[PDB]
Structures are given as structure tokens and as C-alpha cells.
């Protein structure tokens, strides 16, 4: 069946000229609302959540791991390094790298998390260990953001990402202290106010991770604490056929607004 919310999302998509993917889980009842929920989309920097969570998982058996230093050499800097460039020829701890990756979207910090896991396949292996059979990370930064239509690399589906984000932030994929740390990091994101957040009532609390890339790819994944309701998880993925299209965070906001009104 096509619901009223799905029809509105289809109209939004048609007007946008791109391809939109949405998955909502409402923990009030565990019901899901999906739009293209089983289609693959490039994750771009939303994949930073999985990498940071995988390192948090390692920290459950190594109480000092998040204090472990990692060398930042000049050759490690990639194309967006607002935090890591201040540490070149020095070090950052795994906690600092995780915070920089999640809250500033630092691509050098992401590459250090990937390396701590043994490469992109180490992130995919963690995803599988927590029940996500869909996610795949194939490349490091920055090339994981090429977002080429039809390319399977570095993709997931909205449904799979919403389920995993639920398990990570509200469920028991991580130990209690690690889950609290991930939620703290997401709630302190600096990049999210024009994306899902912009479509929701201002009284609600949001933790989110954005992403963007070529093909005008514009993404956001969020855990939401509404007013007077149990938490939600919402994934909004958008990509465009025109390679040099500008990103459209407003489309993500519009999709979130449609979802919120249909609750
Ligand atoms: O730094 C960014 N991107 C980037 C980095 C390096 C090269 C190119 C490039 N290559 N070719 N054209 N641009 C683009 C970037 C973009 C967005 C965005 N844009 N739109 N919606 N979100 C948001 C953020 C952040 F971190 F603040 F969340 C960063
Ligand atoms: O690295 C990129 N982007 C980036 C970097 C850091 C944070 C965020 C972000 N975080 N949150 N939202 N965006 C986004 C990036 C962007 C483009 C692009 N954009 N437009 N045209 N080409 C192309 C590439 C590449 F290498 F694959 F070709 C990479």
C-alpha cells in the first residue's frame, strides 16, 4: 500500500528532481515508515557513525583505548580536516578523533578510525556483528563520497541504517557507557541544523550525523526525542542525477516535516 505520508514524500521527490530515501522507526510502537527503504544510497559521512561505534565496541574490552594516541602526519591530511590540521606532527586520542569525526565531520579523523579497525572492511565487519547485513564500507576518505549512481561501494539502505542506528543509540549493540558516549557525541553535532532538525518542532531534541558528496548527495541520520513521545530514529538520504547539482539540505528538512506531521 501507498500511505498518505508516502504520497507526500513522492511529491517532494518529484519536485526535487532527485532520488529520496526515508526510513522512520517509531519506538512508541516499533512501527516503520519507509520511502525507497530498500534501495541503496551512498552513505557519505553518515558512515562515520558506524566507524565511531566500532571503536567504542573495541573500548569495551580496553578501558584505556579511547586515550590511545594516534600520530597525525602532514601526509594524513585529506580534503576536510578542521580539527586534525591543528594536531599535525602531534597526536590525537581515539576519543578526540571520534568527536572530531562525528561533531565536525573531519575526514582525517574518520580515516584514523578506519585504520584503527583495520581498514574499511573492519567497519563492515562490525556492522555484520551487530546484525546489519546491508551496510558496506569499501573505501577511505575522501573517495568514499564519490556517490556515483549505481555504484554499490560505500552504500546502505534507509531501512538498514535506521535499524542499526536504533540498535546503537537506543538498543544494546554497545555497552551502556559506550551507548551514552555515542549519544552525547551525536547530540553535540555542529553540522545538523539545516537538515532533519530544520523540519522538526523546535522543542524536540535531536542527535544526528550529516553527509554530502558528489551528485549533489545530501544525507542525514538522526535519533530524535520528541515532546511527549518515545524516541524516533529517522534516516533521510538524497542524491541527484545531475553530477554538479548543489546539495539540498532543505529536501531532508521537508522529508522530516512530512514524517513529523504524519505521526
Ligand atoms: O566540506 C564539505 N564538503 C567538501 C569538502 C571537500 C571538497 C568538496 C568539493 N569537491 N567538489 N565540490 N566540492 C566538498 C562539506 C559540505 C557540506 C554540505 N554541503 N552541502 N550540504 N552539506 C557540509 C559539511 C559539514 F562538514 F559542515 F557538515 C562539509
Ligand atoms: O569529502 C567530501 N565531502 C565532505 C567532506 C567532509 C564532510 C562532509 C560532510 N559532512 N556532513 N555533510 N557533508 C562532506 C567530498 C565531496 C565531493 C563533492 N561534493 N560536490 N561535488 N563533489 C567529492 C568528493 C570525492 F572525493 F569523492 F570526489 C568528496
TrEMBL record:
It catalyses: a beta-lactam + H2O = a substituted beta-amino acid. PROSITE patterns: BETA_LACTAMASE_A. It comes from the Bacteria. Residues 21-236 form the Beta-lactamase class A catalytic domain. Coiled coil: none annotated. Pfam families: Beta-lactamase2. InterPro entries: Beta-lactam/transpept-like (IPR012338), Beta-lactam_cat (IPR045155), Beta-lactam_class-A (IPR000871), Beta-lactam_class-A_AS (IPR023650), Cefotaximase (IPR058131). Gene3D superfamilies: DD-peptidase/beta-lactamase superfamily. SUPFAM superfamilies: beta-lactamase/transpeptidase-like (SSF56601). It is an enzyme of class 3 (hydrolase). Its EC number is 3.5.2.6. Keywords: Antibiotic resistance, Hydrolase, Plasmid, Signal. One of its GO terms (molecular function) is beta-lactamase activity. One of its GO terms (biological process) is response to antibiotic. Belongs to the class-A beta-lactamase family. This is Beta-lactamase. It comes from Escherichia coli.
